[PDB]
Amino acid sequence: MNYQPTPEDRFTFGLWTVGWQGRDPFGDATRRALDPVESVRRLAELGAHGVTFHDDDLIPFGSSDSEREEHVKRFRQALDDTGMKVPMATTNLFTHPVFKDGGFTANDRDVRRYALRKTIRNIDLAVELGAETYVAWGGREGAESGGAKDVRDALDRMKEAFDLLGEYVTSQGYDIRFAIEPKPNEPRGDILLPTVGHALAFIERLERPELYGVNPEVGHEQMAGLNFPHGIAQALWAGKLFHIDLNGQNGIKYDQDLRFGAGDLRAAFWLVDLLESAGYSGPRHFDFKPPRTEDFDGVWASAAGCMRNYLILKERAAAFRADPEVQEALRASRLDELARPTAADGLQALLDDRSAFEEFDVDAAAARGMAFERLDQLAMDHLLGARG
Amino acid sequence: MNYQPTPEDRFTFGLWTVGWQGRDPFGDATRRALDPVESVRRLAELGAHGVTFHDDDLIPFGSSDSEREEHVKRFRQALDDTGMKVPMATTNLFTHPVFKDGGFTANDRDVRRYALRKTIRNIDLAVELGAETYVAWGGREGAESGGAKDVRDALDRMKEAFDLLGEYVTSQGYDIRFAIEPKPNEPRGDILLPTVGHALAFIERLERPELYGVNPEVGHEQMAGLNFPHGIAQALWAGKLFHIDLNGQNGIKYDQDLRFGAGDLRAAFWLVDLLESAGYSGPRHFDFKPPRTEDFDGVWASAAGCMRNYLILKERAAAFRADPEVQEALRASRLDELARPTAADGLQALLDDRSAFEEFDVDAAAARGMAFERLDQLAMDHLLGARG
Amino acid sequence: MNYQPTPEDRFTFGLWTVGWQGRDPFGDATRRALDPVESVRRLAELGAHGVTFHDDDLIPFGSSDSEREEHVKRFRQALDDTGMKVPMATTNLFTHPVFKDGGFTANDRDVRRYALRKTIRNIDLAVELGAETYVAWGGREGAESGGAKDVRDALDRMKEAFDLLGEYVTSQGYDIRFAIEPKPNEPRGDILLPTVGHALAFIERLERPELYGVNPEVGHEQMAGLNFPHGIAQALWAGKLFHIDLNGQNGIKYDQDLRFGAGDLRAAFWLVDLLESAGYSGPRHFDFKPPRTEDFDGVWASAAGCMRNYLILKERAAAFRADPEVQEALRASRLDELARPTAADGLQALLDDRSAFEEFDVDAAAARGMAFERLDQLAMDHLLGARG
């Protein structure tokens, strides 16, 4: 009825999102840089809960130890002044030329050691600022050509790096967990761990798998043509959805990072339905870029729209699930039977059950319609607010 | 020099590949059906090692117990007459209308029980014929719309089904392992476990994960725009490449199942390089469809081309890796350093190493070229046989 | 407020849409065949304006001249009984095995002559039934491999065929125009004239270009990742939008033919906005397939949803364009300036205008935001009915 966000809705934004200056591979910046303190103050006014950062967003690369302490103290004063929190942080292992062949899986061993030391330094800072999750996006881990990267050796190096970071946080006694953010390509021709599935599988080979989960991004799974709500369901089923990046993407192309709600709107509806019905309690983080057509007024408009669209879709998904006509349709399509075990009676009783094979009437079962189109049109009517 | 296959090269083909009659979603069959016995005899003449089958390829659906025994005895005589083996089998849980919403994850519980009984019946037959691997492709597990399938409940049902099949083979004492074949879409709008990564992650949640691996198909990972050699490397790293389906695909579109070598030729080269250098010893199985433009002479031509193209690429990948100029290029691009541990000295020594951070010269490291373009042009010259 | 269609809304459906039996490349039919007369009666009850057909949907292939007249007279009685019209017809040049390498561009010359005679026979029947548009979808014109089809010779053959059909209708004095329906792939690996742009360009090389336009389909341009409203705008700008096929598609994959509104919902909104604001007056034709999960009740539900979703989106697009806040936003984003000529003053005056170059303040112009994100969030609020 009213779609105004409050800090209770847990909306967070990266400093690099509203602060994106608009440089793209074919053009110069269209906006001046934003001071982090200014972004914190503006986002607080719009109803945000908190902000996230890469090390190099907060502390310019090369900074002396004294300049570092000064940048952090200004930031911390803005947080104290506004009540904003810092629930997640991450490391920039992709912008500087030294990371051109990767950080953790760079072929040069000295670069891999530097990447780990740069990361550990920022984990300490994140803990100090209260973050609960530390994200890793290995944007430069990958290759443009087949012989440049032995992927088995590279996964050994990736496992080695995350194992060492797990050793580090446990030896320091820190309460922080790691989340890997997959992306299939860009800026490398193919990036390692390209989808939520590949990241979940990798984590199971780590020495302390309980410290690691995923940080999926809407547009990145869509760059592989995959269904983002399905991949989130698999991450929830595994107990590994530690954080999430929300935005929009129009299909398979360069990573657009549009505001949330833009892109595939029906997928956004089914994602919000799933997060709210599964009781996801982490931050609703927006990793988006206000288009470079916009001035600063359009940056804040686009950030506000992220939050607005989540809250509209939350309302429509809740209306859908509460509608008694929809609940009857779900039974007509046998979603209740999907949730019942196939064979709680056990293997032997299944083998002995003639009604499951010898005397199963396949033709009668085949003729039963699933009634999915009526259910989906109810979902469409709810999304569009056209119910009668 | 000569590219003639022998049974030692372990090339296998599904009965459904050369026996595809050419029916597609817009047209009728263009070829008559092939008797399985005829396919076994023809494939043996071409140098194949063996064949694979779905239950319903070998025994027509509905078959009485007596017709069943007759179909199998004819098949077995053809195997004995030719020396052909049967290393893999699988179940058809996708053609009959009863499977229109899935087999293991159908919303109707009675269909899920029937799907398990149909599978178990064919596992017994596979063991009898000597198969070592039992493949599952869940082509109908999935959805066209968001509300039709709760994916968390569906993954519970999928895990329940594979857990019961594992219970079955272990209680029977059978030496057979399972391999899941991913596909991202088609015939369902989105299929569950859509990529090698999602399947590997799922397997780790099974009660007896050691019995399950993957059966990746070249064209299916390419339908998601992903790099198939990279996904195979991840499956090999996990110890889970139990079988493989070889074919060709021209990018993101319907599943073409072209002959191996067609489609993305450079990816085929890097796949053969990887399988041969990792010492993959399972079958080289072709899951392909001779185009419906062809008569039976073109079917056998297309099957022969599958094997020929593997053997040419095997030769060119071996020439590449043996060339001393390539070995020097690999060192110039630091592939040797990629295989060395980043920090065998351990965490504490890494933290104490000033050369890894405080005194690391990032600018000097950044200026080092990786020399990947020269290496990739050596790989291209080898593939095209243009070395001088 | 109420979304009930009437024949005045001009909604039409192909006989092959609601009559699709559910056979797909991996499974058997799940529905029995529908008698055309039954489909006409049911669609009339739902508020449809008319139906369209391929020759072989109405008259089974091989039909004797006497069976033919009988099938047509039954159909015509159903049309008379219901008030349903037949505004478009088309030819099936894709199902029968003889068309496996194409109809108009088959390499065999005798098949190309047969394809033309089969087409001409149905044009006469279409005129008799009152159709105004004759569609051609060359689903089999194309190739799976490079050497199979010289595309320059094939375009000569395609032009030859359409030129002969134009000669035929003009010599007969018929008032019917042709519309080419593009599709980029499936069932051939690549289809000729794969997008609206390629079809529009081809038409300009025909001997009588005024007789030919396009029949774009939502999901087909989306199978190439393209923006369907943009391609429709280009077809309208050229004066060539003779008919349109409405449906839904979830990105780049096999042709789903979902009901209209499903798939990319925001693109559907912008398409309806464009058709209604440009005053498109032809039929709103649905080329869709009710999913094979459905029984006949779900078929009619899915057909009804096509019409419902058009009417909801029509209402929301009209509300958007009528909102004075949106009209002010359009001026803020300078859509009014886009519609003014760049240089009605002419070339010489442009060259003499120092304000266009020598004294143009580029920095001041660059700093002007375009305000597109606020406009797009107004469009989102209107679509979701969340305006306040």
Next chain:
Amino acid sequence: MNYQPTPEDRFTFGLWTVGWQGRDPFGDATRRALDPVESVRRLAELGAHGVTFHDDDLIPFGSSDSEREEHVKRFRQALDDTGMKVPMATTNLFTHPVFKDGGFTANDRDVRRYALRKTIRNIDLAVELGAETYVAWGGREGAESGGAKDVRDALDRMKEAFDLLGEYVTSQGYDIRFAIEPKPNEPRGDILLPTVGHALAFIERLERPELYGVNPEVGHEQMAGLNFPHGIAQALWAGKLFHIDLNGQNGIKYDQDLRFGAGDLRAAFWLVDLLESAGYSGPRHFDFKPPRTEDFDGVWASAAGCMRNYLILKERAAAFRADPEVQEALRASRLDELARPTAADGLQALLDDRSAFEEFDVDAAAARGMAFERLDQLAMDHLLGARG
């Protein structure tokens, strides 16, 4: 046998290709800038025929009239010193922030006038340097959202701009023609005239269509999943292939601009076959970016590989077409019949020919295999140099 290029092979390169500094949307430059004079000298040593440029590659933006004359005179001396030619030039209407919503179709009218004056200034310079073709890539013409751009008004503005440029060159008496370069997306969410087909159709609506053709780029049509050799065939059939940009792309993703031969190798083979057999006589221009992993030695290696791979593929395509076994296969697949008119006897004789319908044996025609798989395996053997 030897693959050394000479200026006779007409290979050309943009200054922006070898001079790309490696800045991408997620990272800083990895190479220093190259002086244009140095690039001309190095490319001449490698066997190139000439170079191309944007205005802003040669003359830094903002340059005073005196600095301008100096930059051009240095360049011209390098051309004279090396024998290098300048066959094409183009305008940068995409890098500066003023072009953030387009050049010719920017919503702001003053920006559209500036874009035309910037273009005309560089056409004069191109003519002075001897260029024959002037390319336009409208990289910023397009939109991220639906309401931001009325595409019909934008195409009016695009036509207005190209009509004025045609007026300009004709009134000046210049012998130069224009070529539009399509791209479907990036950096805008959708770009206008996204494919070769849309550009060819647009040109037919210009006032003097004979002055305009296309400049297709391999990777751009592949970003839409389309077959680049087919689109080139359509451009050749229309008489509109005025220039071509050669490079490589691995499927549907961001524009990679890899060296020619990388990406889809079989498509490169069929493209070279087509250009050489159609007798394309324009420049073989490489629009590529040496990956940012490389130092300057890798830049020159990658440029050399462009030329090498064209010359290898030229040899293999010529061997294919000259092989008598291939010529017999082409007849077996009836490529000779494809080139014969379908009905040179005319419409009336076709209607009177009972052998084309009443007495056509469709079943006999349908059973004829097309023998395309054998032909395609001959093409594969030739490409890989595996003929015996």
